[PDB]
Amino acid sequence: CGRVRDFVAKLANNTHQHVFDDLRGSVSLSWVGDSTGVILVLTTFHVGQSKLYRSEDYGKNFKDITDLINNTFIRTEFGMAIGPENSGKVVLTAEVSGGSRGGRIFRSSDFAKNFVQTDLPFHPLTQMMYSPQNSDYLLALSTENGLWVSKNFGGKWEEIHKAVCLAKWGSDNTIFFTTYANGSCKADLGALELWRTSDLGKSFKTIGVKIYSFGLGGRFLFASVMADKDTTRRIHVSTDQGDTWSMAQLPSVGQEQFYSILAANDDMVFMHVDEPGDTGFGTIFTSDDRGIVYSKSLDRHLYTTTGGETDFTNVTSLRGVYITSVLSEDNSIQTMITFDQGGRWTHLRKPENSECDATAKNKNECSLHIHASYSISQKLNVPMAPLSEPNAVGIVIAHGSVGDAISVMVPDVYISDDGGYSWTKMLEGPHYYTILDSGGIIVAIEHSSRPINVIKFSTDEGQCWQTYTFTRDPIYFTGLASEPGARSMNISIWGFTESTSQWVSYTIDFKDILERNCEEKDYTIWLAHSTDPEDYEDGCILGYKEQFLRLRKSSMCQNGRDYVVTKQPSICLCSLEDFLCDFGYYRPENDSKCVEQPELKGHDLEFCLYGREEHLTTNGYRKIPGDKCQGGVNPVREVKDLKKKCTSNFLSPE
Ligand SMILES: *[C@@H]1O[C@H](CO)[C@@H](O[C@@H]2O[C@H](CO)[C@@H](O[C@@H]3O[C@H](CO[C@H]4O[C@H](CO)[C@@H](O)[C@H](O)[C@@H]4O)[C@@H](O)[C@H](O)[C@@H]3O)[C@H](O)[C@H]2NC(C)=O)[C@H](O)[C@H]1NC(C)=O
Ligand SMILES: *[C@@H]1O[C@H](CO)[C@@H](O[C@@H]2O[C@H](CO)[C@@H](O[C@@H]3O[C@H](CO)[C@@H](O)[C@H](O)[C@@H]3O)[C@H](O)[C@H]2NC(C)=O)[C@H](O)[C@H]1NC(C)=O
Ligand SMILES: CC(C)(C)CC[C@H](NC(=O)c1cc(Cl)cc(Cl)c1)C(=O)O
Q1: Counting CB atoms within 10 angstroms of each CB, which of 143, 188, 560, 565 has the fewest?
Q2: Which loops or segments lie on the Extracellular side of the membrane, by the record?
Q3: Which domain holds residue 585?
């Protein structure tokens, strides 16, 4: 078929080993900035001692720098608090003697080239969080629950509040936080007060009361608020940093139930609502651009109690794709894929030339199922969850099983090149996988119960593989390390030698394999989401299309660190299909027309009563968030009020 010529030579001088000696217990690994190569490894022993190593060559070599931390014990609960973007900021938290007035931290702002010791006025309880806007601003919680802020990269710390439960950095250096009063975080549960500060402690606005918890997702601020003289609670949303609030058109839940933001962006949110009682599943709801109107998207969606596992996944390598796990009435688990932001859900197409397993009734008719967080959690033989990278268009890699449900059997690895529309067995049996050079190189390692010395690699998007021995002395493989963003050609293999054990990391550079830099000819045209090429509206997902330039399976070259995915939108004509029913409307039968509700029951009535103005004055239809269609159809009707249809049954006072 097709394999790389004279590869053994191209990799030998490019392979780079490093023996880390030690390293019983902890082994933390942190990348520090993009296009640097700075990696930091932190090993903690016990009677103990700590050991820190720094690389600058993508993990090909390290230099022990415990010296830079004046040789002290470092707490791994806090780990290595790394700064955003290329701020080069690193914050290690030291262990102090019991009687101390406050903690101690080591800090670098120069990619771990120089560390600064700093004693604190408090004892940290949380990892110091960096502001997304300014890397010099940090916030933390004391063991006393006081909110401490710093405006000088942890040099000077000022307590800005005292009974803080949870705090979070918003956009433009804002800080959101809850506070208790009568006892503790656990006590005042659902009775807490949500606050905000834009002047890092100077002023404070109470932005909520009877708060159970809060969270940020995309453009929204969600907070669960507890019912007056009741154990139940419901979601409320603010798109204006707490200033204005509005109840979410979602069910209310009990103390034994939860809400989880499965996914959030500038357009909408995927919200998991736990089903009442120990079920180990809930319901997925997709929001509108206001984060208020919700559409039931998926039933019996696996999500163990509390949080807890979920197989919910954003297939980051193709627009609108998400795979998750649903629970069958006959207590089996099925994988469901959505190509249109959870509009429509369906089974994953089984690979063409693939046989159905013992889980399936028809031996010729079944689907692909994916092993993710939940499978992993059940000590099922899954070394890795599904992996997709946004720069590697259409590629999805996962351990799955072809059949009617997720099977306990030892999984093989499956790949997709079109974002989950079509699948193919990539490798037999479990493996650890990585995407290099934006789909230029796919790299694999077998999940053996005994030592290994080989790395498998592909240059044709997992269609053809090649074995390569990287070491004479095999190792008990532990994991892989590659620079986030899947742009490098440097992969770090990690393990430990057979015993008197010692950790080691062989780092291969694939620079000589892809000695040729890609050029215009190497890329071909690809219409994302193609189903029927005859159809004019083919590839129309969420109102538009996208034509890509993708490197040929054929072409075997380097896309380069500067690689820019080139895509091109084709704006489609609006149809009813680009609209969700606003509040008080529903879609009966196969029909796409949003019909007015005969009567509003459950939580629709709750909102119909306890809700508000704009959301109730419904146009009947709303444009799907992220929907960029133009022309065609539009709901030709006036903005009509509904706080009459509910109240029409209630005897009303004067
Ligand atoms: C599922 O995964 C998808 C792929 O990762 C997610 O979609 C991607 O979302 C990102 C971020 O929204 C889009 O990338 C760009 O992000 C920037 C935001 O960065 C900063 O830009 C400026 C300058 O700093 C400023 O506005 C802020 O500081 C921002 O923080 C946007 O400004 C760009 O316009 C652009 O959106 C990707 O384009 C997008 N890709 C795809 C394939 O969709 C998706 O959101 C995930 N799904 C959910 C529901 O979360
Ligand atoms: C794999 O790892 C090697 C190091 O082991 C990486 O090498 C680094 O290569 C970059 C260029 O690609 C060098 O950056 C510098 O860029 C400026 C321009 O901004 C230029 O003026 C400098 O002369 C230099 O090229 C970097 O110094 C170099 N580092 C080392 C230690 O060799 C390599 O980039 C990694 N491979 C991939 C594909 O990411
Ligand atoms: C308004 C929100 C942001 C959604 C929080 C609301 C709260 N959330 C949680 O308890 C919770 C939190 C996490 Cl991080 C994960 C899980 Cl699975 C559950 C609830 O259920 O009242």
Answers
A1: 143
A2: 1-654
A3: 576-649
